[PDB]
């Protein structure tokens with residue numbers, strides 16, 4: 001069974017392990033533990049009795065930024081990243097959020113595809129934005145319009 005819930009403080013060690021494993025460019029610890037707390041709507045997906053995925057999102061006024069989505073490699077290509085993001089988008093709609101923003105490196109084919117399927121649009125391309133061991137890499141800024149529902 002797949003259960004989506006709030007990512008609480010006790011969940012953070014588990015999510016910090018998934019971060020190191022899943023991301024080609026993991027966050028630092030200070031970045032990871034800082035992106036929690038007020039204005040954060042952070043979520044986990046629990047597959048059976050294991051954390052499968054988490055998502056880090058900050059809500060400001062009627063907009064939101066997805067800072068992080070990660071699916072544990074053991075769980076990838078199984079629909080769980082899409083599922084987590086769908087429950088997030090639904091949750092953002094109930095909160096009056098009209099646009100979900102993210103930024104993604106141009107070579108992240110899997111992320112880019114996930115976002116395409118959810119309806120994210122390319123807002124802009126930041127040329128040579130991310131410094132890497134290889135030099136620089138473009139960042140794509142994407143926006144998902146979230147249409148208002150009756151409640």
Ligand SMILES: CC(C)(COP(=O)(O)OP(=O)(O)OC[C@H]1O[C@@H](n2cnc3c(N)ncnc32)[C@H](O)[C@@H]1OP(=O)(O)O)[C@@H](O)C(=O)NCCC(=O)NCCS
Nearest residue numbers: 022068069070071076077078079080081082110111113114
């Ligand atoms: C991006 C990520 C969250 C996708 O989650 P997931 O649960 O594996 O993806 P899903 O199974 O829900 O499917 C999402 C879509 O992306 C496509 N996709 C997923 N992995 C892919 C891959 N490795 N290569 C190409 N396409 C891929 C899927 O086929 C699906 O699109 P489609 O069914 O219309 O073809 C996962 O790859 C991950 O954790 N990556 C590392 C963390 C990361 O880089 N996050 C994004 C920036 S913070």
